[PDB]
Amino acid sequence: SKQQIGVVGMAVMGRNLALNIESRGYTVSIFNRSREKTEEVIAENPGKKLVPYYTVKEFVESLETPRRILLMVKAGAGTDAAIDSLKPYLDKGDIIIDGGNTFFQDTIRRNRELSAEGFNFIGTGVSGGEEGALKGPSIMPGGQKEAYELVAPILTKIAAVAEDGEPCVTYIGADGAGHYVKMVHNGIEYGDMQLIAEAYSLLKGGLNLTNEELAQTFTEWNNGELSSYLIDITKDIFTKKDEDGNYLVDVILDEAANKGTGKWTSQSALDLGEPLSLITESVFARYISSLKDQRVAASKVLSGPQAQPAGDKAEFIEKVRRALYLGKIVSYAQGFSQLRAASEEYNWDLNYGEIAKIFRAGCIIRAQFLQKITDACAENPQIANLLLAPYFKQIADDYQQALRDVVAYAVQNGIPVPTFSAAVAYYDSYRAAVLPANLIQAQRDYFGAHTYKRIDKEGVFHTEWL
Amino acid sequence: KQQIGVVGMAVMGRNLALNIESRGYTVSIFNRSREKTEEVIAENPGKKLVPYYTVKEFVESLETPRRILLMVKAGAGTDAAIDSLKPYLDKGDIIIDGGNTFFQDTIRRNRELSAEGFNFIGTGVSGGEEGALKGPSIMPGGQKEAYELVAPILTKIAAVAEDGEPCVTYIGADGAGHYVKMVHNGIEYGDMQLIAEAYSLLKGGLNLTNEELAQTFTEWNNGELSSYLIDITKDIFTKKDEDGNYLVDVILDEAANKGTGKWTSQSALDLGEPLSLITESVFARYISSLKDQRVAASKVLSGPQAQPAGDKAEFIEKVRRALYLGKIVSYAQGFSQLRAASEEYNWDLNYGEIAKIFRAGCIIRAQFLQKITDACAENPQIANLLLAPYFKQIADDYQQALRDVVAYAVQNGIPVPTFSAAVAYYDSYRAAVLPANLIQAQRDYFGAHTYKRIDKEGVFHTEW
Ligand SMILES: O=C[C@H](O)[C@@H](O)[C@H](O)[C@H](O)CO
Known part of the structure; x- marks a missing residue:
């Protein structure tokens, strides 16, 4: 028998x-x-x-x-x-x-x-x-x-x-x-876990919530638009105790390991010319977590502020929730833009809506959120960036002030928020018709005669700046 | 012969x-x-x-x-x-x-x-x-x-x-x-982006004219920030187009690099080094190159306008301090990468000597390199420049300005990717405990990857 x-x-x-x-x-x-x-x-x-x-x-x-x-x-x-x-x-x-x-x-x-x-x-x-x-x-x-x-x-x-x-x-x-798609799924997973980790840092640092309160907060978030497998397991993790009565989350060593697909997604963004800032900052956040001995030493010599007054509890929780959801939107807009760049470079004619569809269940990033992407792609298969789709654009209109407030609070409090920070910087750069890259191009022409282009005439130009 | x-x-x-x-x-x-x-x-x-x-x-x-x-x-x-x-x-x-x-x-x-x-x-x-x-x-x-x-x-x-x-x-x-030439190029991209954010803040927040920007950069160039790149920047802001208008204002804002600017960051990723500032600087050039997308998005996406800047001299000083502390963080990340590369490729690099040859001739030349040379002379195997007395003092004195500038920019809609990365790195490197404990719990929950504990030795797995 075979x-x-x-x-x-x-x-x-x-x-x-x-x-x-x-x-x-x-x-x-x-x-x-x-x-x-x-x-x-x-x-x-x-x-x-x-x-x-x-x-x-x-x-x-x-x-x-x-x-x-x-x-x-x-x-x-x-x-x-x-x-x-x-x-x-x-x-x-x-x-x-x-x-x-x-x-x-x-x-x-x-x-x-x-x-x-x-x-x-x-x-x-x-x-x-x-x-x-x-x-x-x-x-x-x-x-x-x-x-x-x-x-x-x-x-x-x-x-x-x-x-x-x-x-x-x-x-x-x-x-x-x-x-390639599995690699991008893993890069998105790294970004979702770092975004959740920043929300945890904010709730614990800003409100001093207990683990039981953190679990209740994540449970409430999981009942709304943020529902996802990663938030569902997070709510469970915050109440788990070991045989001695210790909450596991507080005895687990904060050294985030990895097996490469996170670095690969970012190395591919760098090869393709894609500004994949949020997933890349998530990889770097795992890397600095892995420098535990250096962080312990530095924590004893480098100075910093204490957390600032957070204001009304429920209002602060809702701003962190909105910051987390808009952060996710920015991370996925960067990831799906990278899928388009890879499809063009490697000649795959990828079907972005079908990729989002298969991530609605099974995978680690599964969430109803993937249906929002599936629907935006169905309506416009070659959409350049998810932020332009009406659903996403309107969430950004509604939630960007909460995200800005959360980042300002975290920075004044000394709470690191690399991905929420990156999300604001990307949103503000992607919507900018003019960036200070004009100065960078003038500097390159000055020190290296690299030439630059103008907004009022054709061709390349080189100037004697002095 | x-x-x-x-x-x-x-x-x-x-x-x-x-x-x-x-x-x-x-x-x-x-x-x-x-x-x-x-x-x-x-x-x-x-x-x-x-x-x-x-x-x-x-x-x-x-x-x-x-x-x-x-x-x-x-x-x-x-x-x-x-x-x-x-x-x-x-x-x-x-x-x-x-x-x-x-x-x-x-x-x-x-x-x-x-x-x-x-x-x-x-x-x-x-x-x-x-x-x-x-x-x-x-x-x-x-x-x-x-x-x-x-x-x-x-x-x-x-x-x-x-x-x-x-x-x-x-x-x-x-x-x-x-390898060192590559890192010099990564550091150059970081310095240019940091200066570009300072330009964005001064122009968007205070509405400084090009003459005032040149005057400001000239004053900064007299002190601790003294560098070739700040010196040429004040010349650029002074340059008039053959018609009385400023040339920098008609240059297309699409920053090139030629396929090589990504190397430092790719090596950081291979070595496990958190090189966020230089890497955000490469991504800032990449998004400037997506001009058609940026113009399309500018007609669709909404944002705030610049917030009240407050006293002019105070705002300018905070941006100056942010720029200097941001440069310190970028170089701390870059020299830490040099140590990881030296270990991986077996080079026994002399970090103080590398900083010494960057004091002149190169594009990043600046008085600043002497402070790095000094720190490395005192401690040749310093793990990170932030630990050196001079740099810890500047971080103690200037971090509040950096925090004020990032909060202002974020409320104003002015992108500051490298100033943001500098604060996030400083606050992560000094943090004895990060939220990576939750990341490790999650990895163990869904993939049984195991985790370490702070109170016992060994690898553990929990049936969650
Ligand atoms: O989080 C990083 C893990 O090391 C990596 O192995 C993947 O995320 C994997 O898909 C988990 O099963």
Whole structure:
């Protein structure tokens, strides 16, 4: 007997994807380079149609042809090694799906090489954390359309489904487009978590709310326009205690770790000429959190102010709420503008409304907010920036004063607000018909004879400033 | 024979050649295009410049160990020029690439050439076309022995600081010099953006005329802010268009850079360094380049107008203080990046010596660099310039002005990305506890990533 699909990589996401597939009625072969993990999965899941393999040769031979193999291995060297191991055992026409968090340029190279060798390849993002991998993640596949059609049925079976019944999987585009979209999802996730962290800093620093009051505040916010998976889990985190009675949030070390897709999104913004300030400041905020020993030392020598009077409690809470929602809007406007720049550079003809649609459920950034983006893109598929869409434009009209008030309060109080700060600076630069870049261009001409253009005549000019 | 030859007669190369000749040396010059070489000779009669029209004759014209300064445009024309030189070189010869080359390419070339018995010095040269001619800041990395062999020539063509010291020094091995040149360029983008925000605040908040802006920048240039960029800025505000109007007001506000301004920030991202100010400066150029989008958005989006500025002299002083403290933060971030790069690429950089060669010749030259040199002399392995006594004092005295300026700008609709980043960085770096505890809790909740605790050792995971 042979199984229908095989999964390589039994760390949590891959094991949970295998169990997700088996839960839809499929029989699944599994393999992992560290064999003891495969034994663990079998011991922990008696009764499920998972069949373990302990060599790659036997794993491949166990699959119905054309084979469908999903790889969920560590990005980079590990993924290339897994593919190189499978190759000698495959038949032309076999289907390889790389669902790891792979850098998109690696997928463009791999798609080229494997398609030339006659394999059907799909590089796909998978988002949803441990629970979404098990129950239904967002799935963003790229590659040749013929390859996607060979796996669309199974990907649809395992993907999350939106409340309107639409599966959270769709063909993203050619070659590396799917892994590029997964990277941008992770960059947006970094930005949403830093925005929430700044709201927490503001409520705790400005109002001295207790953890119970922070949980109540996030619960109320989750009942309105801010409802999202990240705010829903935050409200839970603030009441969790350990075996001794300590709130976990207060004993967890404030050193935010990362696995790269945050840095990759920002490095891509820098390559594409996109001003992706909010997600990039979120990466830098994780980086400075990781300099804990330096911060502890500096906290003992550098001076600063104390928090200023916050005024009426409910009014302050509502301003922070409005600052957080408008901050999100600015972060996503920057992220979707980057998706357009990447689509143009890499020739993907991305469908932005469809990307937002698959993020309505499954993924970590899931929220009703994604329907607001889906609808703005449906109305204007090539909209240049979400801030121009009526819904977003009007929220900015209504909420920008709260955001400005919150940033001024935080700065006077010494509470760091890198992303709320960045959101104001971006909104005020994007709407500015004239910026002080005229001076920067005059300086470059002065010290380096770089030439500049004029607003009243054609051509390039160079001046003797003295 | 000549002690040194220059390859590439575009403007930078020809100027370097004239600088060297100006010091008393005879210089062999060569160029891929016979024309430019011919053009150069004509323009400077009497200057000892010996032209060669073949790479072979060019190389044989040089005293061993040969010193060949390569000033072709950083790109693929560099590997082409080296490819053409190799067959005529002898073991021990030295190729010196003065292009604005990406440091990883210099690391590759230095490794490849060494294996073939040739030395390779990748060097930054800062100062502009004019600086190259009169005295640039020179930042060379590669084999130290090769550097010491050509150092007599470099020390005579470099700019000189107040204390008489030439603005050149051995930076470190392989690509260390081109890495430092890159960071100098990142710091230059940060200084220009900080000045641009000060201009925005003075013009939008106080409605200063160009004459008043020039007067203000002149006064600032007399004190601690003294710098080449502030000196040229007051000249720009004084420059009138041939019709009595100011030229800066008709320049298109689309800031270029040419695909290289992003390198410092990309390296910060690779090294784990929070280089927010310089990076926001690159993003400010990127958004200025999206002019069609900005004009479209300006017809749709709403915002506040400038708020009452209050006393004029007080407002100007607060902006001055904000500018100086913002520069301190930008350099603190940049020197911390130099330490992380030194560790990653194994260079054992001397930070005080790097600050010393930036005192003159380069675009960021300013009195300020001496304060950094002083701090590094006292403490060569200082983790961050904010910890040095002089800088901690300025931050204690000027932070309130910076905070007042950012709050004013935000209420007024005036974008201040780098002043904003400076406050956020200062308030994050001094914070013993940040809200990253919630981020770690979230990562453990949704992806079981585990977390550390402040009261126990080890990695923990919670069934949330
Ligand atoms: O937050 C950063 C995590 O290190 C990173 O791994 C991703 O966010 C991942 O998608 C979580 O599953």
